[PDB]
Each structure stands twice: as C-alpha cells, then as structure tokens.
Amino acid sequence: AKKSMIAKNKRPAKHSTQAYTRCERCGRPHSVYRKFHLCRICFRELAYKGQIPGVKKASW
Amino acid sequence: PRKGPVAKRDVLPDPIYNSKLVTRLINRVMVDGKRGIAANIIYNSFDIIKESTGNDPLEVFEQAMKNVMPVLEVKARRVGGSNYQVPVEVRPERRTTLGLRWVVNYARLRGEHTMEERLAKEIMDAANNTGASVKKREDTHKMADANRAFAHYR
Amino acid sequence: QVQYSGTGRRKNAVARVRLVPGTGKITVNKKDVEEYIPHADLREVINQPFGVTETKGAYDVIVNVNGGGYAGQSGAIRHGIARALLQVDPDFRSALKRAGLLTRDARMVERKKPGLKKARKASQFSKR
Amino acid sequence: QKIRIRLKAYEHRILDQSADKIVETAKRTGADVSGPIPLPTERSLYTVIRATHKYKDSREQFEMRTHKRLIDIVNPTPKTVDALMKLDLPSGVNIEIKL
Amino acid sequence: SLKKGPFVDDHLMKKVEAQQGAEKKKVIKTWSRRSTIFPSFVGFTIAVYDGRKHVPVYIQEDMVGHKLGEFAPTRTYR
Amino acid sequence: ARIAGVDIPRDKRVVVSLTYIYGIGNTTAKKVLANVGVSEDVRVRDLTNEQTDAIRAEIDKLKVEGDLRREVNLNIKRLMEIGSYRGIRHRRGLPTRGQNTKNNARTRKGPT
RNA sequence: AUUUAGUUGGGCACUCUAGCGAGACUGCCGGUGACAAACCGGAGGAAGGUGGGGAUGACGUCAAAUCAUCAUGCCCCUUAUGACCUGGGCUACACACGUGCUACAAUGGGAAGUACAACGAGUCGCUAGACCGCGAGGUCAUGCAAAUCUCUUAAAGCUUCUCUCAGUUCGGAUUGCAGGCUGCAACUCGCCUGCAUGAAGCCGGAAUCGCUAGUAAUCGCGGAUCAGCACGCCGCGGUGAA
Ligand SMILES: [Zn+2]
C-alpha cells in the first residue's frame, strides 16, 4: 500500500495541520528536508552523482 | 606508557605567596577550576593558622611538608600473578603527590560543618602532627617493612 | 602625543593595546584593574615582562578586548606587553625570547567529532 | 555616489573575475572606483547518516560556501549606468543591482 | 478552549439543538470525542462511541468542564 | 494552637510560623508580612503579643483550614464519582498528558 | 571636535573580511651513530623534526544488515490483500535491563549590583520603544531580504547578611486553583508560568566504562524534523585537574 500515499499529499489538505511533505522521487515520510523537498538518503546519493548544485563534502 | 617516558608539567609558584608547592596544594581540592571558592578559603585557612599558633604561611606550609612527608612507598609489581611489591624509594615528585593527596583526600574524609573550618582544622592537623593524614603517614610507615616478608627476594 | 599599538590573539579575542607612559594601570573597556576583573589579576601572570624589561616600570595601559572569561582575555595581556617591548627595546628582546614570552598559543576550541559526545569524550561503553 | 551593486554566488574566482570585468567597464568610461568588497561568506551545515536501517553513528555531513561581493562606484556618468543596465554577463553567476 | 469560545461540534450541536425543550431521548449514536460541554446540555442520554463499541451515558446538571469521551475509554483493561 | 491558626513552631521567626503550616507556602507569607512590615530579628520570637494575635487574625483571614483535607476529599469525591476517568487517573497520580508508567510507579505504590 | 551613543567632518590608520603570496619542509649547526639511516641538543623561528584537527578504510575477514529508499527473478491475490472515511493507537503497567537528567549538602541557597563570545537563523518569518500584569503573556506600532536590523549585553566569579547544620533558604515528587499559547480541538494524546501539601533522596555492593591536556570535570548559546512539542541530537563558545 504505497501508491495511495504518493497521490495522497497532492490534494489540498482537509485542515491546516495535515500539511506534511515527503520526497518526490521516493516516499520517505521521516527526515525530509523542507528546504530541499528531498528525503535523507537521496540527498547523499544524488550528491555523489554530481547533480545537486552547490553541495560539497565537509572537513575542518 | 608503552613506547617510552613522558613529561610531568611542573607547576608555577603563586604570585602572592611565592611558593611552588602551595600551588600544588591549591590544584587538588579545586573542582571545575573554581579558584574563587576553594583557593580563597585555603588562603583563609592558612590565615587562621597565622592568627592562631602561627606567624608566616610559608614557614607553616614547610612545617606541613615536614609532618605529612611520605618517606617510603610501595608499588604492586607482580611477576607470577601474586601479591608482589617492595618499599621503593619515593621520588620527591611522587612524595609531594602522596602527601598532598593524603591531605586533600582526608579533607574530603574530614567533612566539618563549615566549608573552610574543615580546611582550617585540616591544615592545623597536617601542619602540627595531628589528624589522620599524619596518621596516614604513620600507617605508611607501618606497611613500610611490613610487606617486606615477600620483599627480600629482590 | 605618545601612544603604542600592540595586538594580541588568544582564545578568540584580539586585544589592541594603547600603551601610554604612565605608572602601570589599565583601562580595559575604560575600566580599572578591578572595575572589570576579579581577584584573579595576579602579579606574575599579568606583570611578567616588567621583571625583565623596564623594571619595575610601569606604564599605563589602554585596551579593548572581549572573548574568553576573566582568565582568557587576561592571557591576551602578555601579548600586548610583548609587542610593546618589541616596539621599544631591541636589545631586551633576546632576554624576552630566552624567557619565552612571545610563543603564541595556537590552541582554540578542539574540533568536536560526530559519533561521540565531544571532541574526545567517547560514550559510556555499556557492554554488560 | 548613487551607484552600487552586489555579486553573490558559491565560489570566489568567478565572482571576483566578473567583478574585475565590471569594475573595468565602470572605470573605463569614468573613474573613481570603490573597493571590490569581500563579504565574510556565510556557511551552512547538514548532517546525514550513511546507512538505511540501522547505524546512526555513521555520519556523513555536507556544507555550503557562499561568497558575496559588494561594489560601489564613486562619481558616475551616464555611460557606466548604460554599461551596468545592458551587460549582466556572465549568466552562470547572479548579481543584485541597485543605484 | 471554552472561555475563548466553547468548542462544541456544530452539526452534533444541530442534532442536540433539535430536541432542546423536547422529551429526554434514550439514544443518539455519534462519535463524541471532540466537543466539550457548556451547561445548556442537561438531561440527555447520548451514545458515546469509544472507537470500537459505543456505550451510552445519561446527562446530569453537574457536567460543566469536559467532553463525552471521558467516560468510555479505549482500554478493555483486564 | 499554638499562637496563629494551626501548625505553629515555638521560638522560630515569623516566616517559619507561616511556612510549616498546612496551607501556606512562602510567597503568600511574604505578601502578608509585607502588609504589616516587620522584621524577624533574628530567628527567635520573643515579641509583643498584639502583633502575634494581629497576624493570627490575619491568618484567620486566609484559608488555613483544618478541614482542607476534607475540602480536597469532597473535590475528589466529586471527581472519582461522576464517572470518571480522571477520577481513576487521579489516584494513579498521572496528569492530563499521560505520564508513561513503565517505571513511574515508585511515586505511590513502590513496585519493588 | 560633537556624543545618549563614534553622528559626520576622517580615511582604512589599528582591527576585521577575503584575494594573491611568503611561510615548519631535518630548512642550517654541534655531538652520538661505519662516514649508513636515525637519534640526542642547539641557532633562527609564531609554528622543529609529519604544528593541532578533518576528507580520504587496499586484498579481504563476518551467508553481518537493508525486498520498510528504489530496481528486482521466483510463489500468492486482484468485487480484494487494491482504494476512501469517523473513533482509536503504537503514550497501557503485575516486573527485569541499557541510556539521559536532578539533588541526596554545609563547597548549597536567597537580596543587592557587576561582567566577558562564537556559530548561525531570518520578508507572513525574527520583534524597536511604551502600556498593563506575581506570571505564562497580551496590547499600539517600528525595523529586518542583511557585516546595517530581531533571537542576540551568555554562565560559573566578584562584595556584603543569610538558612548557621536539620529531610533543612538542600531538594522538589504528586495533587486543588489562577491562568498563558499553538491548533478544528490539548481527558486518550502539546508545552509553559504562578498560588497552595512539601514526597523520596541523608554520596551507591559485585561488576563496570570515558580519557593521557585548554583534555577530563563543569557552565551557557544556536540549529534541525517542526503551527505547537527537547534531560535527546548536531555543532559553538566559557572555567579548567590528577
Ligand atoms: Zn528521496
């Protein structure tokens, strides 16, 4: 039962406190970045793909 | 540790008393670097000595270095697993370590109902032959040459 | 007018010293020796290079430093006297250097690693 | 003097080479250029784990560096204003213009 | 809450507004978990539904500061 | 008994004669002693009887109740006997948020 | 000079930011050492023998774990296991264990004043000033796309009396009341203030673990997922042992 919850959030919400977001290529409800609209692990992997603008590895 | 030796980081003297080992006595009660409470009430306790049976704090600090002084020390050096040690000749580094650890961790053991009268009576004891830290020097004299039954095959 | 310029960097606090010939004071944030500082304003801590150069002196200090506690930015005081004596006396510089007095501490806050609690404090290894 | 622009991007070299290009075009038609002001480069943080199901401790972090430039111009002319309203090249870098 | 406006659900209010000055009924099947009580509700007997099986309760005059779901829990605790 | 309402210790100062009592903590005692405006001086109570009986009447103003436990008993007599679920949860010692009793029983029952 | 302010006269002077550079690389010297590596000591130097720290984990070792990121062959259904709604719950407590926080006290408190940063976040998001509150806060209304302005003048110290040794000016557990704010709403199932009982705790037994220095031990600031919801997390700074 995964394809109901992909088309679920594209509706306008029933009330104001159900506006939760997730990833778009995948469907992780936990640990989505609101400034990205990507989930956790796809940011890491697509960052290793060399396609996300900006982001570099970190060492200091 | 395993590779070789290591430094010891000797302490600087006070800019008030001008004595190095007084700083070593400061830096064993002081918790979280709180010099404001603990070191100042140590100042207050040695001034209590100065006001009652005392003249100068440096001389009575040397008098405490007399009557607490660890003359010997043992260290458990097993060979085959058993309780094996010997009264070793103490370094004046480790002499000061043992003696001031006796004084400070007996000021822990004392626990009198004023936060510096425990220190005042602690250094009135450690400076004037009394208190159980001087009796810890007595008991250190005791086990010196009392574990010697297994310390003469060396 | 006569005034000096000596900078000093310890514990993330630059310290510009406007040293003027006086009697030996401080106006730290234009405040005196204990209008800003508690009793930990000790003699051999602050007034160390006066015992090797301009003995006993001293001259009055103007400075503006923030960063660190009372003992941190007081460590920036020695760099001010170091750069002041650097400005003033070339022949006492060797007596400064053999007594040290100019070796800047390169220490900052240590980098705190993930996977642990702190920079070095590993977690409680609760084996069993 | 009533002309000022901002230059904001990720890196440093493309920003300040384009800054030198537009400083060239500005002080060519007139004079009196101000400084190509380095801004202290606000930095981000992120913290992402490596695995999927377990193993929270295996961190793998990412950050962002955003250099910024401010350019003022003293004593302008209508020609440097025409240079700054019909030339915003390069297009890979974005600018923030005022007057 | 209640003093900055009573929080009573409107169409269930419209179910109980229809029988204000009428006879005290026995059963009104509802959901009864969100609306609080202000004292013009005295006398009824409305079927409180827990989530699995509804259990009714009658209404006295003392009920002034709570809801209907505070008496049929979701426990089945034994 | 003794000199001011109930629960009075003897030869203790004025904040103690309102602090120990079943019904008044400290800040109400602070405002009541601020209404009169007297000093403790220091820990002993050897002062005039007119002030002690005056502040006795000032305690007789307030709700220092010998049947305050009966008041809370009638409050919980209503509370446990409408239904009620918070009447059950009152004796559970658990608030209106849920308190997650997985080790939280040592307050009342002592589950050892 | 003016000042309540560094207003604008003043330029980047010191500082600061970021651009190119120089820089600590056995770079030089004395001795040990076969003249060999290397070692012990100097000189210069801010940094001496890879300055402190990060990114970067070979072959493989362990059927370690991931079909609950996604792809995915094989066996199963497709008037149901697919899909839509209302209430619930994953937060319950007869017990055991791992982790985090608070005191168990005369090194702790209360009244007073007085201090010291860095990393950031920020235009339906942070609140200037003033008003009214024991208070959660509310009210008039300003700024702020950021080196301007909002969180945002950090805490332990410093100097007085104090509880002057008690379940106690140690401490705050559960409970009645005044409330405050988010939401469509805070019994299930958010957080906080204040008023009122003042719980237990009166330094922990085997067995443990963190760690060789601005580090242990300790005190504050911000950020994430987020309308609301940190003793957790991720950093940053402050004091600083053996
Ligand atoms: Zn994704």
CSV table of C-alpha atoms (C1' of nucleotides) in Angstrom, one decimal, chain A residues 1-4 8 11 14-17 19 21 26-28 32-35 41 45 57-60, chain G residues 52-56 69-71 82-86 121-122 183-185 223-227 235-236:
chain,number,residue,atom,x,y,z
A,1,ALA,CA,0.0,0.0,0.0
A,2,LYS,CA,2.4,2.7,-1.2
A,3,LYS,CA,0.8,4.3,-4.2
A,4,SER,CA,-2.1,5.7,-2.2
A,8,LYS,CA,-2.5,11.5,-1.1
A,11,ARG,CA,-4.6,17.1,-2.6
A,14,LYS,CA,-8.6,18.8,5.0
A,15,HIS,CA,-7.4,21.3,7.6
A,16,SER,CA,-4.3,23.3,8.3
A,17,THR,CA,-2.4,20.8,10.4
A,19,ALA,CA,0.5,19.7,5.6
A,21,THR,CA,5.6,16.8,3.0
A,26,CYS,CA,10.6,8.4,-3.4
A,27,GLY,CA,8.2,8.4,-0.5
A,28,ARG,CA,10.0,8.7,2.8
A,32,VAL,CA,12.6,15.1,4.6
A,33,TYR,CA,14.3,18.4,4.1
A,34,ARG,CA,11.9,21.3,3.6
A,35,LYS,CA,14.5,23.5,2.0
A,41,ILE,CA,19.4,9.3,1.8
A,45,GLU,CA,23.4,9.6,-3.1
A,57,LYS,CA,31.9,17.4,1.2
A,58,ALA,CA,32.9,18.9,4.6
A,59,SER,CA,36.2,18.8,6.5
A,60,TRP,CA,37.6,21.4,9.0
G,52,G,C1',46.5,20.7,16.3
G,53,G,C1',42.2,18.7,13.6
G,54,G,C1',39.3,16.9,9.5
G,55,A,C1',38.3,14.5,4.0
G,56,U,C1',40.4,10.1,2.1
G,69,U,C1',14.8,4.1,-0.2
G,70,C,C1',14.5,2.3,-5.1
G,71,A,C1',15.2,-1.6,-9.0
G,82,G,C1',-6.3,-2.6,-4.1
G,83,A,C1',-8.8,2.1,-2.8
G,84,C,C1',-12.0,6.1,0.7
G,85,C,C1',-13.8,7.9,5.5
G,86,U,C1',-15.1,8.6,11.6
G,121,A,C1',18.7,31.6,11.5
G,122,G,C1',15.7,35.4,9.3
G,183,G,C1',-4.1,24.3,16.6
G,184,C,C1',-10.6,22.4,14.2
G,185,A,C1',-9.5,20.9,19.1
G,223,G,C1',20.1,24.9,14.7
G,224,A,C1',17.4,20.6,12.6
G,225,U,C1',12.3,17.4,11.7
G,226,C,C1',8.6,21.1,13.1
G,227,A,C1',1.5,25.5,13.6
G,235,G,C1',27.6,22.0,16.5
G,236,C,C1',29.6,26.5,19.0
